[PDB]
Amino acid sequence: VSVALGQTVKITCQGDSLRMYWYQQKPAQAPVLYAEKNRPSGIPDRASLTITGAQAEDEADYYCFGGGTKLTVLGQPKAAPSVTLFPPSSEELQANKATLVCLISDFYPGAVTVAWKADSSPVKAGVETTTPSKQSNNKYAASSYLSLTPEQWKSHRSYSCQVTHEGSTVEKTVAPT
Amino acid sequence: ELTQDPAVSVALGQTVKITCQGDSLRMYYASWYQQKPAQAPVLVIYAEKNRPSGIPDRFSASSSGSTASLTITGAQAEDEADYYCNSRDNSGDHLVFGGGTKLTVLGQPKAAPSVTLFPPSSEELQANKATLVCLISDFYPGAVTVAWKADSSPVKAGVETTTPSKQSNNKYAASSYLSLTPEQWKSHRSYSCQVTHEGSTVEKTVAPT
């Protein structure tokens, strides 16, 4: 969930007990403070939460308990990820190893979801994905990798890496030889 | 309205006690949350005595007066996180939270990084691109220095390296990539990725085929 500076956002909470009947948590900080119509005090003033005037400091997790909503305050333009799926190299295959690397770069905001496929079959066994971190251009980079045996690599028609980034999905597919 | 030290350390397999202090703790039992970077908080203990399903038996909680404590016996590598206490706050149906305590688990087994260097893929060369990727995995502690080479010449421009993050095995992973044009890739005899991890340096080399 992202918003531009000075723009309007809506964070939504879904589940039971909402038919019958606010905490802000910045990274490595305590979730600080009621129910739809209430007047709090201590932090600057103005189920779903709406923020009319958004500042870079407002970038935090909001909780109604909900799973958590990472509100991103756009400090720069949105950028879809550049996705490159690298197949196992000849050198790695000659060493009886196979690793596929899905390189994800130049994206903003810094949140992605990665899914893998063996042919048309979704796979998650042997998958590791790194936490996005800032490049020198202030955009983000991450990598997801899938460890396979060379027999698994050669016995499949293809392998795919799918990257989801705020309503955009980029899938890259590679095939042996 | 609850106080706890910002950080604490323990040795692997040893016991750690994280304490919270506040007037509300004399009236209410504390709940404990575990939070790792880029992850949703996990309820580790509910109102001192309830351990939810999925939470290891290593976690327990106790209290005395205006203090509440979370005890981790036989602290594991997966237990490194920020631990926050929470409770109700006297006259008023609202919750108060502690500032959080970051836990460091010392004496964890060290590991040299596994380094895999990929040449440009056939799809990116067909698209007039020649980015190389250097996968750095299964290392501990989570700090590396990455340097690239064009034959024997060090490369500064076009290099990006990710901050190491934990894998599901509690070892770290990172990647470094070098953006090149097919021209730069084909003109050199080889390119290298050298990774420095404490007393170890691992370098891999790829060549155009």
Residue numbers in the entry:
A (entry chain A): 10 to 30, 34 to 45, 48 to 60, 70 to 87, 99 to 211
B (entry chain B): 3 to 211
Paper excerpt:
LCs were distributed in two groups: a set of eight amyloidogenic LCs responsible for severe cardiac involvement and symptoms in patients (hereafter, H LC), and a set of five non amyloidogenic LCs isolated from patients affected by multiple myeloma for which no amyloid aggregation or proteotoxicity was observed in patients (hereafter, M LC). Five H LCs (H3, H6, H7, H9 and H10) and two M LCs (M7 and M8) were successfully crystallized and their 3D-structures solved. VL and CL domains display very different structural properties in the seven crystal structures. CL domains (res 115–214) are typically characterized by high quality electron density, are all very well superposable, and the dimeric CL–CL arrangement is clearly conserved in all the analysed structures (root mean square deviations -r.m.s.d.- generally fall below 1.0 Å over the entire CL–CL dimer - Table S3A and Fig. 4B-bottom).
However, low Tmapp values do not correlate perfectly with LCs amyloidogenicity, since M7 and M10 LCs unfold at temperatures close to those of the most stable H LCs. Inspection of the SDS-PAGE gels shows that the proteolysis pattern is different in different H LCs, suggesting that the sequence of proteolytic events, and not only their kinetics, may be characteristic of each H LC. It is also remarkable that fold stability and kinetics of proteolysis do not necessarily correlate: M7 displays the lowest Tmapp among the M LCs, but also very slow proteolysis kinetics; H3, H6 and H9 show relatively high Tmapp, within the H group, but are almost instantly proteolysed by trypsin. With the only exception of one of the two VL domains of the M7 LC dimer, the two β-sheets building the VL domains are in general easily traceable; however the quality of the electron density for the CDR loops is markedly dependent on the LC crystal structure considered. In H6 and M8 dimers all six CDRs (three for each LC monomer) are traceable in the electron density; in H9 and H10 five out of six are traceable, in H7 three, and in H3 and M7 only two CRDs are traceable. In some cases (H6, H9, H10) CDR3 (residues 89–97) participates in the interface; both CDR3s in the H7 dimer lack electron density, while in M7 and M8 CDR3 residues are located far from the VL–VL interface. In the structures of all H LCs and in M7, the association interface is roughly symmetric, and is located on the five-stranded beta sheet (strands 1, 3, 4, 7, 8), where the 3, 4, 7, 8 strands establish the intermolecular contacts.
